[model samples]
Target: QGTTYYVSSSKGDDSNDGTSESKPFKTLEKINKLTLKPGDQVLLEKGSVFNDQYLHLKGSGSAEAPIKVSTYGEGNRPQILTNGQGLWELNYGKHLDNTNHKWHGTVSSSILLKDVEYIEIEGLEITNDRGTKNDPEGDKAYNDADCMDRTGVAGVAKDKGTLDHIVLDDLYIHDVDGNVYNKHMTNGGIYFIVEKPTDENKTGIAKYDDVQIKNCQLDTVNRWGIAVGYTYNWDKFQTAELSDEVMEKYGATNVVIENNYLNNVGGDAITTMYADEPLIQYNVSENSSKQINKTDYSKPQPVLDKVTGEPTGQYQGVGAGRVAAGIWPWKCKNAVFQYNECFRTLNASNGNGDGQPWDADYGDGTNYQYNYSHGNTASTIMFCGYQSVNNTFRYNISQNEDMGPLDPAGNAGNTQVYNNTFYIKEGLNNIWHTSHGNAGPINLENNIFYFAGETPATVENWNPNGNKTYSNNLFYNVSTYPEDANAVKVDAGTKVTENAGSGPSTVADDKQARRHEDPSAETVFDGYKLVQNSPAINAGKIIVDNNGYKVEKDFFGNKVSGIPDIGAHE
Candidate 1:
């Protein structure tokens, strides 16, 4: 039989039995001392406040009947005010000493879940503003904090054990900001980092699996909106780099970050480190990540130095030490990012010139589809092929006025780009900066590259390497044809067809050469869906995976016709 415990600060006493609502306990400290089992629920009374205390729920639940820490006796969802310490920290110290160890003389989170599994933490409002203001030095870990003095909501496991089936839902996390140190990575509204274990800590391989974060709202939070996994940055932790080996050793998997909204963030909105097969979808990140310097993390712009009338040199590394962009998976294979909106990001930060709204960095089998990226200050999307292989970018709407549409800087081989709508705003640069030397088996097809300006500069090196194949692509407003004049290779392996451009009249482009200005202002959310009878409709070739699975759906979740339409939406 499972017991239900009631916690009420306004009524009841610790001396009374907590099983009944009328005899609810007055404090969470009483409940944290108990040994809870599967199917146990810790229900804190709505409208009640737990201040300066960590609700360290210590227990686990079965797959069929998991433990739940939620609100009841409604007035409003129970509020957990960390005051300084974590408000509700889950500590399953049954098998380890990680609970006794501290991160930076502080617990560092409002709601911390450690070494527990099959649990749900929901319906709460949390904040750590006291620590944020009293100690502006908190953010140093991401910079000065050194991954120690962080205050937010996080799930961490060190030498304790493996945690599984964790779900964080229906949270209203806001005004929880970080200081200078939080500029690097980790620490956010909901942070789940599986640290690599060593003798410094007793645990072997801190891990988590089957994590889900849904329907949460994070506003005015700094550093990251959400950051999952730590082992993927193997070099930082001194772990080996292979996906299978790292995932198996660290074991963070099946992560789904969906239906969350992040606003006014100081750094990256959503990032996954080693989460395998992770799906990041339907999330909105707006007016966020602009407070940090993207290309150079050392300078805190907008917040200038007190003496020099210049930027305070703080955050370090490229990507602002993971402080730029909206959503990107680092070191995870076969990751899919769909229906996510990244806007007005990567603009103010001087992090990297390629601080794109979306990027696939150092990972193989990365797929970015059905996503809307626009209004960003940096490039729309990019494949930083520093160590990537066989990545694909398709069926995405990338419309913005900041930088180029795509930059395949270091792609090695077998990189695929097709069925995308790359729309450049009226005054932005229209250039496709690609990897001319490292490309091996690249394919560009069934895509629309529309430059809204009157005169556009064409790429000089279209297919510098003989391994490129271009077909059914529409390029407008360019002086020279990409297939004929720019793409140089003429081998039988290099194939080009239905490649049309301009009024000067090349092979097939003679009469059908079309020009439309301000292409993005016409679609839904600048989604790249063509107007009625638009030239891009049905202009694309059907794309398929190596297994011959044909492209069946468009960006709006519509079924593609036998001859699919170009761009993201059907």
Candidate 2:
């Protein structure tokens, strides 16, 4: 049998049995006292407010009938107001802020699910906005931070063994104003952190399984909008290095993040690290990377201009810049990022120059395909490989500022870039190369490029930046290709024609080159597609021997069975 407990702030009493809406519990303290079972639901009354309370769900449920902490009635989702108190304080007896530290505590979030499994938290609004430091003489705690302890919804499986079958759906998580002073300590929004036990008795790592987040709306968060990883660490390749024994013993698997909308987040929109078979698709993220210009709390501000009510000149301070990506997977295996829309992403100026739409950073067997990125500030897509191998980018439209394959760690082995459309506009150059280090064995094939920009003054030679094998590609509407003395060479079968000015007079599709607008702007894959009668239809070389991997479908789920089309759409 299943029990249904009710919680309401207005029409509730702790003396009641809490079995119905009329006899509901008054506070979270009564729910905290109970140990729930399978198929039990703790439903909060709609449009009610639980002030200064932490919804600490501390039980396990079965797979057939999972325990649900959701809302009832049709007014609005109940609000969990964590105004004065902190989540860690209710659970662990202490909290961390500007003046509070030195206490032994774990990291915290407003809705914390620690070491529990087979539970769903849905249809709720959570926040942690309370109490700014009003003192003139503060402790400067965030200035020298190595790690932080703040979040909106954090599922930590540290020293607690394996957590499985967790789902968070349709949650409107917003305004998580957490810290972002340091990379390691920054926190906000949805995250799952796993760690190896540090005690002498416990040695194995904790991991998650069958975790999923879907249809969630996140906005105005402090650090990250959505994040998942094995360790509580960031930056540097050495942090993720794990032995084979440890990886097999503890690692995340079967993670699916889909259809989430994240807006105006301060950190990365979606980041999955050390994951296996992670399918992140169909998400829309915009306006990430909030704090490019930071202020020194100790220093006084300049007098504001009365007209705009802002500082006169640049407000300079100690540089603690941050980087944000639309979506990325780091040190993952078999990770697929597709059908996502990233627009107007901002780039970092100081520490890391990344304002990209998507990235495949330091992993194995990853693919970024059929995604639309437009008007980004930096590289639209990137491959930052410390030891990355065998990644693929195909069938995507990159109509942004600057885009190319980058192997910052120089160990990006045998990367593949094929069947893509690179549309350069506004007097920009469509430059492709191996960046930061050794250019790997890049295979560029069956692609299309349209550079609608001004002719260079010198009219130098057409330069293919790196040593890569190219094949059966269309470069049209490009102004000049006069020979440069220092032009780099290319591999065999590299056809740079089917264009307005080219070597092959037998080129089939020259009139199809122009500024192709997005098919539709409202939904994904609708705006970037090959129109009917376009030469991109079945104009591709039959890829019988794809290098270890091949795309089976186009952007709009068109069957790419045999002789596929040239660009992203069939």
Candidate 3:
């Protein structure tokens, strides 16, 4: 355990005065100068503006105290501003401090925390200047672009201390954004890593355990919101140059992201397999999902000047940071998405040209369960690599949206779709394919699928061994023609049938069960809406995580207790 250390505005002593709330130091430099004895508390003072330098804490606390570095403040909500003095102000044509333009151009991160252990960053704001994506001196550098990346506050750590037990809570990680670095190797709230090939026999990043990140907010990330990748560029092709020691340390495991709000982002709310095993839950990914820069051939674009009108060498790097497109999860695994909500995501039309593909080569063992997905217009999600397997997607609340193609085809595998509400406003096919593998045993059951599209779902080009199962699922207005209103009709000659439930017994809301006249009427409140009260509601018979919680119901536990009437509420 580590010793508890408090840093507060009230305490201003540095030398041994103890990094306690009562004797907190003012700057990060003060702590770096001191040796971290295991089990020390390096308390940081709330409201202290330690501008200019990044705070690098690189010591381990005893498992007890774990060298706790927390905030001390006057109020319940203690605020710390990483953005220095104030709003970004350009002085001498350059960003004042890193906080102002941490990620705008080619440079990587503004702050870094490397080789830290048993640490917690709570109730703080890691904000940067908001600037343009392609401008060296623009706001996107610090605000919207890779606001946090590459450096875990202090860069890479290769010593004895494990970069483990990192807990970031109640932290507001926003951007001012973008970087000159290649799509910014690492972009998001914060990135930390041990340089690959770190004597894996002695220590492994996988052994670095207990990684918990919860109750924090990732708001408005223009590019992919969060990232964790190679500390150094692994993209350059040179097998001879590849370090075997470095390869094993590449992936991260046991990453938990929960109870957070991830607003409209350029990428996934939380993309884990971008590197490793990530458990993302109770989070909300809303607004537009992905968007790339619209190309313009109209202008003979001028080589922008760095300072006042004089063109500088820096301008060349500016053009290099254009936004990439599409959902990006090509190499990731063991991702468990639970109890989350994804709504109103604008789809991406383009993709990153950086040889790293936007849609292929991944999706190994991805379990997307109990997620509430609604109101999307673009394509359905994919596991980039069709070869990806053990992808069990069940009990997903996806309604009034287009469940685009399932995958590019051949590379995908074993999809389990059960007790989900698939109500697409309109779409060509809920599931489409061009890949090589067969779409097998994709069980769709106990769903209130009100179709407003031409195709609810389809599986094409399967290797004859392909099979899709649809049962106990109701379809209202399935196709443009009411004749096709049957639950499902597979062209691949796959099994598609309906189970006689307790009479199409759909899961229903308590209130809706009593008043529902038509099973297709969506529920509305103040403005929000839910799929209608149908057998799909309480009718879903599976339960994953039990909170020992009971929902209110009208009768027979048919309708979910307290919520609204729409979109398969449970």
RMSD of each: 9.8, 9.7, 10.9
Q: Report, for every candidate in turn, its global Cα lDDT versus the true structure.
A: 0.62, 0.61, 0.42
Name the lDDT value of residue 559 in candidate 3.
50
Question: Per-prediction TM-score, please?
Answer: 0.77, 0.78, 0.63
- Segments in model 2 whose C-alpha atoms lie over 4 Å from true places: 89-108, 131-148, 184-186, 198-205, 232-248, 293-321, 349-352, 402-411, 432-441, 454-465, 480-528, 531-538, 544-547
Per-residue lDDT of 426-544 in model 2, one digit per residue for the tens? 45543442234434445666666655444521212233335555565555455443232322222222333232111111111321112122334323234345555555566677653
Off by over 4 Å in 3: 1-23, 76-111, 130-162, 180-184, 198-207, 228-251, 274-277, 288-291, 295-333, 347-361, 402-409, 426-447, 453-472, 480-570
Pairs clashing within candidate 2: 148-185, 461-482, 461-483, 461-484, 518-527, 519-527, 520-527
User: How does model 2 fare in lDDT?
Assistant: 0.61
On the 0 to 100 scale, the lDDT of residue 230 in model 3 is: 31
Error of 1 at 169 (Å): 0.8
TM-score of candidate 1 against the unseen true structure: 0.77
Q: Highest TM-score, which number?
A: 2
| Candidate 3 per-residue C-alpha lDDT over 177-218 given as tens digits, one digit per residue, 9 for 90 to 100 | 432232333444544433433454676432234566677666
Please write out the lDDT profile of model 1 over residues 125-231, one tens digit for every residue: 87755444444344343433332334467776655556778888888887665543343233556677654344425555567778898888888776678887754
Error of 2 at 161 (Å): 2.5
Error of 3 at 401 (Å): 3.1
Cα lDDT, model 1, residue 95: 15
